[PDB]
Structures are given as structure tokens and as C-alpha cells.
């Protein structure tokens, strides 16, 4: 929530559901990155 | 350097030779005398320029009334018929049969969708519609993204089927009637007569986006004017998706405004400011809206939200009254996403009495609260919209015209007055039209006061078109000279009728296309703007024309004779002429009609030959078989009879005219007898000239051709071989040199074009033309223009015989008022004849402008084709320069310096023509060139709108408008 919270302000129309905008969503995203599933997509959103 | 006296004797002999050649070879006095010789085959009738304006004003008022009476018929039947509809929700059994336009006319498809059934129409081909129409039933258009098969759509197709009898009866009472359309509030448009839509959505690769709810005739008849203030929220939390949705939404909202409404876009993030240069409400025309769109696209999101500051700014913008407004609907459109403040104190302070509406839009896909925004919308008589994607934009940004029309509905029968729109280009490819509109009200359970819930919205809008080729038939222009004309005007300045109003969109700025961003097959939209060309942008603008414009915007009738500059047909010259503007108001409507007549055109010739013998003799003289005796003859494509058609290939037309004047007896029952009688008498006079006088001296020394252009539309080029190099228009009222030679009182020289495709400088010659002026009973009359093509080579021979061929000590040039090279001294100049002098020798040209031998005037052409810049043809504004003779002085002796140089020159103006002669020290001696003084359309963008809004042109808005009824409901939000 600190690093990427409210920084997914991308001006396209692609939906990035795994963001870090509030606490339940950040918990979901971190869990998904723990199970390993598609952690690279979250990383690319973070790097962009 | 030669002296002024030797120079002056040179030019005196030069003008003597040129003028005597043109006079004796063209044959002006001959034509004058053979006009004044007969004087009993014709009569001289007057042009009472007050009577003419009043007759044409009544004819226009009658036409618009006939169209009005066909609108109330439609609206009455539509209200009465929907008042008795059942609202069934089953149709799979009881089908609705109807002809859906934009369905493939391939009879092997058999779609006949569930619930509905198609029609295979017959589609005869018609004129008055340059397409194939069927007068049997009405066609239906449904937007591409609206299913035809909803219960809402199938219920509109079920009760609108009662309109076809009214459509047919309207069309049978007046067969000259163009489209009749009912545009419904569900998206449908039912029009008559039936005709396939221009675009099938997907059958070709061009998909169409046409919604009736956004056509300006609809938006015009569906609500009163406004005083809108868009209030964009650019706090930080909107960044990302919702910000770009906000940009697209504000643009698509600005596109639902007219020239009657006023707008401004503000913007707040912990501080409210204007998005652009404007700072108050501006008139929402095409230029201002371009400014506001370009300003909204430059918007960035950063900061903390503060709704109180934004709403203070908005409500203080809506209280200016130091500026011009619409004064009717004060509304605020808040484009936001969401938040937690509602700002009750601002609304309680500023619109405690609820004169302003608030429409709030929640854009994007987010999680912020939306309670307060709905409350703002519901607490302030407004409405609440949600825009989650790009597809929702179009339908959610045009839907506030349902809220704005509840007071119109409640006003009852005072609200049904026919209105006429600006001039726009028809969607079914018909040209410029104006539309008359009238809203249709929903009266269901009306006689007992049962429902009154859905009975606060209109059903749709009725409309009937009136082309401008139909208005220009009530103002027949063939009894005035090529220089007089009718023109009408809005109560807004804009022009409804003008010789300078073409069928192309008004351009704004310079166009810039990006090739590298344009996919090949994505169907970018084309245009939807009206053709709103102001009056002071269709003519040259004096200080007197401003007062005439103001004086006839508020319906006064008057007359004023003055002296003005008149830009020539081809934009290269400028004349000075005496004109008379006589104007009156069109009594039924708000329009105003004016007639421009140059004195010398207060009298015309009316032919008086009815005898078979004379008429037959004359009609013989225009037949190709014997051009050898009369020289190539052209005929104007006028409308002599409703049987033959203008053909744009004039040999075909002359042949048809002949075979018709014979093949149809001289009774001519369906033919305009004054037109063809004038043409016949005219060809008689012209041929007398050609036979008796021209054909004697078969070959003159320097002459290359000899022509006669006249009224009645006859043109004669003497050696038939010359008739192949004649490029002028065959309709004489569009010949530039004709209108120019009528203005001047001397021999007008027309310079050729340069680097133009075609034999145009050497094979043809230089055109001299003088207008015939005859006196019948003390009355001046200019009925013809005689002319000549001088051969360049014989001219050079007479010109060179202290400056000699290619001499490198001085130049000897001849120009015409306009600065176009005519006769040089260099064989390197003379190669570019007809080119603007300041483009070949700019220092001397700029000096000539400085000492004021040449003045100039600049103007803007708002309807031009443009080569898109880098940032196939677009529409842009071009700037046009034109030079002319201001100081009537004859000689100018001086020295021009560029610094360490010196060139001494002498210029002298030939008398009885429009030619000037310059002898100047050479140019190669002094290596000093500044920059080309270009006279050509240069693509530009000015003027600057940020300054016109501070001193705007006078304007008078509608006085009937419906806002703030008391029985309004506003439990809908």
C-alpha cells in the first residue's frame, strides 16, 4: 500500500484487478504473489 | 537614367497604341450602336429594389408557412395516435412490419428478425432527391448499437406506423416537399419518403454513428437555450482512467451545444480557475468550442479536492451579467468521480431559491463514495449520470435535454412554435438545408389527470427540411447585373443565403494529422457541425456594413447607398464600386432579406420579339454547323425550361437547346419565355456584330481572339479555333472579368495564371475587356462586355521599340492593379507572365506598397481545402491578400535603398486602363533580396478568439424560453 498504493493511475482501459489500493485488495495481491500465480504481471504493473 | 518627360511620352504612346487597338478591334462603339439602333425590339424596365425585396420576402414567408402547416399536422396526429397505444409486450405473434433502412437490398437474405418483419421496397429513382426513393412507405433508422427488437423499440414501430398517412397527405398537398422526419426519444427516426441509408453499418467497412438525439434540429426543438458551466474536477484522485474519460466526455458534451447557448469550462483542485483564456461565458460557436476542446485536452490531475471553491467559482460565473448570455437555463455540469463532501452551505447561499440546476456525472470505475454527488444532483433540481466506459459517453452526455424540457412540456401549447435551425449539410446527401422543428408531447391519461409522470418528457421532435436551392428559386437573380444579389441573415449574424456560401464545413485553425497513429481500417468520424458563416466573414467588412448588419438584425426595413470595396470573383483583385443595400424583414420569421444593387443596374432590358420570323432568324444563328460564320458560341446553363437540363458539357447543352426551341413550338408552355426571349434577342445582336463588323478584318495585327460576353448568357469567340482556348465559365454571371469590367470605366486587363496546367500565357494571350454602356432614354445600361486577346509577341515587339532586351542596367515592366506581371523586358521575366511581382522582385514591391501606389486588404476564407501539416484534404482557414490602386496620382519618382545600395526608379500609370509602367535600375547590380512578398492563399488560423470575446459582434437572442416551472416533479435523479 505504501509503494504502489494509488500509483496504478494508468491512462489506458486495461483492467488491473490485482492492485494495492486498499487493505483487502493489498492482502489479496500479496497472497496471490505468495502462491506464485502470475506474480510477474503484478511486477510489471509495479515497474510501469 | 531617363527623364520624367521622355518616360511620360513613352507611356503616352504606349497607352495610345494599346487602347486604340483594343477599341477598334474589339468593336465597342459598333455594339453600342447596334444596341441603340434597334431600341424597339426591346423595352427598358425598372428594378424597384424595394418592391423586389418585399415580393421575395413574402415568397419566403409563404414557403416557410406552408412548411409550418405541415408540421402541426404531423405533431397533432402523433400526439393523438400515441395517446391511444396499448403497450403490448408480445410481438412474436402480432408482427410489426416496417422497412428498416440500412438493410441490404439483396432479396436473398430474408432476415425478418424475431418480432418484426421487413419490407422489400420498389425504389423508383427521383429528382428533388438525388437518390432512389419510394413514396409508398416510410423508412426507419435505428442507431447501430440499439437493438431493434427491444420492447421499447417494437412499441415505437407499432404506433409510429400511423404517421405514413400524414406523411403522404403532406406530400400530396405540396409535391415539392423534401424529407419529413419524426425523430423519437428512443433513438428511432422515421422519415418519408423511404430511401436507403447512406451507410450500412457493416455491409461495407464504414460503420455509421448517427443518433437522432444529437442532430442539431432535435437539440434545437427539444429545449430552450442554456447558460451552461462545465466544472471539471482535476484533483489528484481522478488521474488515470477517469481523467481521460472526463476529457472525452467534456468534448462530447460541448458537441451538444449551438450558437444560441453560452458555455465555459472551469476546473478545480483546492483552487478553481478557468481551463482556458476566456474567463466568462462565451457564445459556443465553432471557433470558441475549438478553443475549449483544445484547452480541455491539456488538462492534468494533481492536488486535493475542494468542492466549495469550485462551486463558488461556478455560481459566480453564472452571475456575470456584464457580458452577453442566453439568460434562460443556468445549469452546472460537475464532471467528477466521487468524494465525501457535499457543500450544503454553498447551495444554501448561492441558489437557495433553486434557479440553477446541477447535473452531476460520476466518471470512471472507482470505489469512492457517490452519495454526496447524487445528493448534489437531486437537491438542485438536476440529475445524476454515471459514465463507466467510452461506450456510455454518447448516451449519457445527451440525456440532460430531458430534464431541460420539463418546463417546455408543462407550458403546454405555448411551447409549440416552429423553429428553424442553422444551415447544415443534410445527412442524406442533399446539400445545405434548414430544418423546421416542433416538439411532440406525451398526453396519455390526459383528459382526466391520471398519470403525469412519463408525461413530463417529450415523445420526440418532428422535422421538415427546406433546401437552399429551394429558397434561391424565390429570389430569381437573372434580371439584375452580374453584380447584384439577394442575401438573408439570422438574428445571429449568420448567413442563410449568400453568393459566397459553399456546401462545405466551416474550417477552424490549421489541420494537423498524424499518419503514424492512424490505423488503416478504423472508421474515424467525419463531421456534424453546421455551416455558420457570419455576414461580416462572407464580404469585405467596412464600418458601414457593420451598421447595416446591426440595423437589420433587429428587423428594421431600410435602404443605404454607399461606396465600398468589392473583392473580385477569383480572389486576386479588389474594385471600388457604388452599391445600394435595401433590406426588409421576413415578417413571419426572424430572418431578414436584403438586396444589393449597383447603380447602373436600376434598369434592365426585357425582350419584345414575339414574331416567328425574327425569332426564327435569331435561333438559326446558334447552331454548330455554321460556327464558321459566327464563331464559337457558348450558352449559359440557365433553367430555360423544366424539360432540358443543364449538362456541364456545353456542346451537349447548346445542341439540346436548339432541338428544343424547334422540337417544341414557340408556344413554350412549360418554358420561361422572358429568359429565352432575352437569349434570342441577344444572340441576334451579337451575331449582327460578328457578321457585319468583325468578319471584315479577318486578321488583325496583334490580336489573337475577339469575344463578346453578354446578358442572356450568350458568349461568342470569333475565330472558332480560338474557341478551344477559351476557359471562362459559360454562365456569364460567374465570369470574373465580366463583373470586373462592369465596375471599371476603362479597359480592364486580366493577367493570366502562372505555372498553371494548360496553354495559358502564350498561346492564348492577355485579355482586354471593356463594358458596353448604352443610353436609351437618358438611362444607363451595361448589357454586354466586348473584349480581345492581345498576342504577347506583337506586344513585346511594340514594347521594346534606353531599356532594351535583357539590358543589365535597368528593368522595364508593366503590371496591372494587383501587381501581376504583364509585359517585361528580360525574356526571363517574360517567361513568368501573370505572376505576382512581389514574388519576383520583392524589394521594389514592398517599397511601392510603402509609398502607397499600391494599397492592400487582407481577409479570411473560412471554407477552404487544406494539406494537413505535420503534428486527403482537410478544411481550414486561409488568409487572402489583395492589392489595388489607392492613390489616384499618376507618377512616382524615387529611389529605393537597402543599405549601401541605391536603385532609382520611376513609375507612371497609363491613362484609360488599369495598367502601370515601372522603369527601375537593375537588380543584379545590387545583391540585396529581402523576402518574397507572396499574394496567395496562405493557410492560417487567426483571428484570435480570446480577443473577439471581449468585443463581440452584436447579436439578438430568442425572447421566448421556458425554465423553472413550479409543477415540475424532480423526484427523478
Swiss-Prot record, chain A:
Tissue: Detected in skeletal muscle T-tubules (at protein level).
Name of the protein described by the UniProt record: Voltage-dependent L-type calcium channel subunit alpha-1S
Binding-site positions, Ca(2+): 37
Motif (Selectivity filter of repeat II) on chain: 35-38
Domain comment, as recorded: Each of the four internal repeats contains five hydrophobic transmembrane segments (S1, S2, S3, S5, S6) and one positively charged transmembrane segment (S4). S4 segments probably represent the voltage-sensor and are characterized by a series of positively charged amino acids at every third position. The loop between repeats II and III interacts with the ryanodine receptor, and is therefore important for calcium release from the endoplasmic reticulum necessary for muscle contraction.
Maturation and modification: Phosphorylated. Phosphorylation by PKA activates the calcium channel. Both the minor and major forms are phosphorylated in vitro by PKA.
Extracellular side: 5-24
Originating gene: CACNA1S
Protein task: Pore-forming, alpha-1S subunit of the voltage-gated calcium channel that gives rise to L-type calcium currents in skeletal muscle. Calcium channels containing the alpha-1S subunit play an important role in excitation-contraction coupling in skeletal muscle via their interaction with RYR1, which triggers Ca(2+) release from the sarcplasmic reticulum and ultimately results in muscle contraction. Long-lasting (L-type) calcium channels belong to the 'high-voltage activated' (HVA) group.
Assembly mode: Component of a calcium channel complex consisting of a pore-forming alpha subunit (CACNA1S) and the ancillary subunits CACNB1 or CACNB2, CACNG1 and CACNA2D1. The channel complex contains alpha, beta, gamma and delta subunits in a 1:1:1:1 ratio, i.e. it contains either CACNB1 or CACNB2. CACNA1S channel activity is modulated by the auxiliary subunits (CACNB1 or CACNB2, CACNG1 and CACNA2D1). Interacts with DYSF and JSRP1. Interacts with RYR1. Interacts with STAC, STAC2 and STAC3 (via their SH3 domains). Interaction with STAC3 promotes expression at the cell membrane.
Intramembrane segment ranges: 25-46
Domain of life: Eukaryota
Cellular localisation: Cell membrane, Sarcolemma, T-tubule
UniProt record similarity statement: Belongs to the calcium channel alpha-1 subunit (TC 1.A.1.11) family. CACNA1S subfamily.
Part of the intact protein present: 578 to 625 of 1873
Swiss-Prot record, chain B:
Family matches, as InterPro entries: Ca_channel_alpha-2/delta (IPR051173), VDCC_a2/dsu (IPR013680), VWA_N (IPR013608), VWF_A (IPR002035), vWFA_dom_sf (IPR036465)
Disulfide bonding pattern of the chain: 378-961
Gene3D superfamilies: PAS domain (3.30.450.20), von Willebrand factor, type A domain (3.40.50.410)
General function of this protein: The alpha-2/delta subunit of voltage-dependent calcium channels regulates calcium current density and activation/inactivation kinetics of the calcium channel. Plays an important role in excitation-contraction coupling.
Additional facts recorded: Binds gabapentin, an antiepileptic drug.
Binding residues for a divalent metal cation: 233, 235, 237
A Gene Ontology molecular function term of the record: metal ion binding
Post-translational modification: Proteolytically processed into subunits alpha-2-1 and delta-1 that are disulfide-linked.
Database matches in PANTHER family: VOLTAGE-DEPENDENT CALCIUM CHANNEL SUBUNIT ALPHA-2/DELTA-RELATED, VOLTAGE-DEPENDENT CALCIUM CHANNEL SUBUNIT ALPHA-2_DELTA-1
Subunit structure: Dimer formed of alpha-2-1 and delta-1 chains; disulfide-linked. Voltage-dependent calcium channels are multisubunit complexes, consisting of alpha-1 (CACNA1), alpha-2 (CACNA2D), beta (CACNB) and delta (CACNA2D) subunits in a 1:1:1:1 ratio.
PROSITE patterns reported for this sequence: VWFA
Residue intervals on the Extracellular side: 1-973
The protein's name in its UniProt record: Voltage-dependent calcium channel subunit alpha-2/delta-1
Record domain Cache: where: 420-511
Membrane-related topology note: Single-pass type I membrane protein
GO terms for biological process, alphabetical: calcium ion import across plasma membrane
Keyword terms: Calcium, Calcium channel, Calcium transport, Cell membrane, Disulfide bond, Glycoprotein, Ion channel, Ion transport, Membrane, Metal-binding, Phosphoprotein, Signal, Transmembrane, Transmembrane helix, Transport, Voltage-gated channel
Domain notes: The MIDAS-like motif in the VWFA domain binds divalent metal cations and is required to promote trafficking of the alpha-1 (CACNA1) subunit to the plasma membrane by an integrin-like switch.
Residue ranges occupied by any VWFA domain in the UniProt entry: 227-404
The species this protein was found in: Oryctolagus cuniculus
Main location: membrane
Tissue: Skeletal muscle.
Residues found modified as Phosphoserine: 93
Amino acid at each position: 500500500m505504501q509503494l504502489f498504493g494509488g500509483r496504478y493511475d494508468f491512462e489506458d482501459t486495461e483492467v488491473r484487478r490485482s492492485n494495492f489500493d486498499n487493505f483487502p485488495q493489498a492482502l489479496i495481491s500479496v497472497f496471490q504473489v505468495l502462491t506464485g500465480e502470475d506474480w510477474n504481471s503484478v511486477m510489471y504493473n509495479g515497474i510501469m | 537614367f531617363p527623364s520624367a518627360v521622355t518616360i511620360k511620352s513613352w507611356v503616352d504612346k504606349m497607352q495610345e497604341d494599346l487602347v486604340t487597338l483594343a477599341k477598334t478591334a474589339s468593336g465597342v462603339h459598333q455594339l453600342v450602336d447596334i444596341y441603340e439602333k434597334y431600341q424597339d425590339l426591346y423595352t427598358v424596365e425598372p428594378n424597384n429594389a424595394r418592391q423586389l425585396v418585399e415580393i421575395a420576402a413574402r415568397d419566403i414567408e409563404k414557403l416557410l408557412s406552408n412548411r409550418s402547416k405541415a408540421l402541426v399536422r404531423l405533431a397533432l396526429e402523433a400526439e393523438k395516435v400515441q395517446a391511444a397505444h396499448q403497450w403490448r409486450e408480445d410481438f412474436a405473434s402480432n408482427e410489426v412490419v416496417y422497412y428498416n433502412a440500412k438493410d441490404d437490398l439483396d432479396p436473398e437474405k430474408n432476415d425478418s428478425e424475431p418480432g418484426s418483419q421487413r419490407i422489400k421496397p420498389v425504389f423508383i429513382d427521383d429528382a428533388n432527391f438525388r437518390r432512389q426513393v419510394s413514396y409508398q412507405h416510410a423508412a426507419v433508422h435505428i442507431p447501430t448499437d440499439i437493438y431493434e427488437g427491444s420492447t421499447i423499440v417494437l412499441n415505437e414501430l407499432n404506433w409510429t406506423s400511423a404517421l405514413d398517412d400524414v406523411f403522404k397527405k403532406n406530400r400530396e398537398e405540396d409535391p415539392s416537399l423534401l424529407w419529413q422526419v419524426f425523430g423519437s426519444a428512443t433513438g428511432l427516426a422515421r422519415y418519408y419518403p423511404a430511401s436507403p441509408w447512406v451507410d450500412n453499418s457493416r455491409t461495407p467497412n464504414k460503420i455509421d454513428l448517427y443518433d437522432v438525439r444529437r442532430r442539431p434540429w432535435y437539440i434545437q426543438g427539444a429545449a430552450s437555450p442554456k447558460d451552461m458551466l462545465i466544472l471539471v474536477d482535476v484533483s489528484g484522485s481522478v488521474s488515470g482512467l477517469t481523467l481521460k474519460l472526463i476529457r472525452t466526455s467534456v468534448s462530447e458534451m460541448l458537441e451538444t451545444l449551438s450558437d444560441d447557448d453560452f458555455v465555459n469550462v472551469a476546473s478545480f483542485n483546492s483552487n478553481a480557475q478557468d481551463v482556458s483564456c476566456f474567463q466568462h461565458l462565451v457564445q459556443a460557436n465553432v471557433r470558441n468550442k475549438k478553443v475549449l476542446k483544445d484547452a480541455v485536452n491539456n488538462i492534468t490531475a494533481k492536488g486535493i479536492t475542494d468542492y466549495k471553491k469550485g462551486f463558488s467559482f461556478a455560481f459566480e460565473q453564472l452571475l456575470n451579467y456584464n457580458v452577453s448570455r442566453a439568460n434562460c437555463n443556468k445549469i452546472i455540469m460537475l464532471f467528477t468521480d466521487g468524494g465525501e463532501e457535499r457543500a450544503q452551505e454553498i447551495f444554501a447561499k448561492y441558489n437557495k431559491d433553486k434557479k440553477v440546476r446541477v447535473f452531476t456525472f460520476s466518471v470512471g470505475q472507482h470505489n469512492y463514495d457517490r452519495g454526496p454527488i447524487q445528493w448534489m444532483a437531486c437537491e438542485n433540481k438536476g440529475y445524476y449520470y454515471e459514465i463507466p466506459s467510452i461506450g456510455a459517453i454518447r448516451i449519457n452526455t445527451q440525456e440532460y435535454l430531458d430534464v431541460l424540457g420539463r418546463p417546455m412540456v408543462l407550458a403546454g401549447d405555448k411551447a409549440k412554435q416552429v423553429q428553424w435551425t442553422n444551415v447544415y449539410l443534410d445527412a442524406l446527401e442533399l446539400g445545405l438545408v434548414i430544418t423546421g422543428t416542433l416538439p411532440v408531447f406525451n398526453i396519455t391519461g390526459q383528459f382526466e389527470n391520471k398519470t403525469n409522470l412519463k408525461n413530463q418528457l417529450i415523445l420526440g421532435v418532428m422535422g421538415v427540411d427546406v433546401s437552399l436551392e429551394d429558397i434561391k428559386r424565390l429570389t430569381p437573380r437573372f434580371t439584375l447585373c452580374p453584380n447584384g444579389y439577394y442575401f438573408a441573415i439570422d438574428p445571429n449574424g449568420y448567413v442563410l443565403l449568400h453568393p459566397n456560401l459553399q456546401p462545405k464545413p466551416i474550417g477552424v485553425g490549421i489541420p494537423t494529422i498524424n499518419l503514424r497513429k492512424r490505423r488503416p481500417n478504423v472508421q474515424n468520424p467525419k463531421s456534424q457541425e453546421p455551416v455558420t458563416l457570419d455576414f461580416l466573414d462572407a464580404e469585405l467588412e467596412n464600418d458601414i456594413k457593420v451598421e447595416i448588419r446591426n440595423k437589420m438584425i433587429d428587423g428594421e426595413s431600410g435602404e443605404k447607398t454607399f461606396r465600398t470595396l468589392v473583392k473580385s470573383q477569383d480572389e486576386r483583385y479588389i474594385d471600388k464600386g457604388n452599391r445600394t443595400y435595401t433590406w426588409t424583414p421576413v415578417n413571419g420569421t426572424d430572418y431578414s432579406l436584403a438586396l444589393v444593387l449597383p447603380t447602373y443596374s436600376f434598369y434592365y432590358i426585357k425582350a419584345k420579339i414575339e414574331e416567328t420570323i425574327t425569332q426564327a432568324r435569331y435561333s438559326e444563328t446558334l447552331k454548330p454547323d455554321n460556327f464558321e460564320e459566327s464563331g464559337y458560341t457558348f450558352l449559359a446553363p440557365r433553367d430555360y425550361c423544366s424539360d432540358l437540363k443543364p449538362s456541364d458539357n456545353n456542346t451537349e447543352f447548346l445542341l439540346n437547346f436548339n432541338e428544343f426551341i424547334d422540337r417544341k413550338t414557340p408556344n413554350n408552355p412549360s418554358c420561361n419565355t422572358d429568359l429565352i426571349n432575352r437569349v434570342l434577342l441577344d444572340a441576334g445582336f451579337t451575331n449582327e456584330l460578328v457578321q457585319n463588323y468583325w468578319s471584315k478584318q479577318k486578321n488583325i495585327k496583334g490580336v489573337k481572339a475577339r469575344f463578346v460576353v453578354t446578358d442572356g448568357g450568350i458568349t461568342r469567340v470569333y475565330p472558332k479555333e480560338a474557341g478551344e482556348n477559351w476557359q471562362e465559365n459559360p454562365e456569364t454571371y460567374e465570369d470574373s472579368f465580366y463583373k470586373r469590367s462592369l465596375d471599371n470605366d476603362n479597359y480592364v486587363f486580366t493577367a493570366p495564371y502562372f505555372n498553371k496546367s494548360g496553354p495559358g500565357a502564350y498561346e492564348s494571350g492577355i485579355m482586354v475587356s471593356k463594358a458596353v454602356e448604352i443610353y436609351i432614354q437618358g438611362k444607363l445600361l451595361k448589357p454586354a462586355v466586348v473584349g480581345i486577346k492581345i498576342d504577347v509577341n506583337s506586344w513585346i515587339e511594340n514594347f521594346t521599340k534606353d531599356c532594351k532586351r535583357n539590358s543589365d542596367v535597368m528593368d522595364c515592366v508593366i503590371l496591372d492593379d494587383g501587381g501581376f506581371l504583364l509585359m517585361a523586358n528580360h525574356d526571363d521575366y517574360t517567361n513568368q507572365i501573370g505572376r505576382f511581382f512581389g514574388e519576383i522582385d520583392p524589394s521594389l514591391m514592398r517599397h511601392l506598397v510603402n509609398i502607397s501606389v499600391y494599397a492592400f486588404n487582407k481577409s479570411y476564407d473560412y471554407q477552404s481545402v487544406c494539406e494537413p501539416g505535420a503534428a486527403s484534404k482537410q478544411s481550414c482557414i486561409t488568409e487572402q491578400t489583395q492589392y489595388f490602386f489607392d492613390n489616384d496620382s499618376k507618377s512616382f519618382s524615387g529611389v529605393l535603398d537597402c543599405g549601401n545600395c541605391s536603385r532609382i526608379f520611376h513609375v507612371e500609370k497609363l491613362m484609360n486602363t488599369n495598367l502601370i509602367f515601372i522603369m527601375v535600375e537593375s537588380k543584379g547590380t545590387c545583391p540585396c533580396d529581402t523576402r518574397l512578398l507572396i499574394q496567395a492563399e496562405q493557410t492560417s488560423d487567426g483571428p484570435d478568439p480570446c480577443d473577439m470575446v471581449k468585443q463581440p459582434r452584436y447579436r439578438k437572442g430568442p425572447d421566448v424560453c421556458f425554465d423553472n416551472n413550479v409543477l415540475e416533479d424532480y423526484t427523478d435523479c
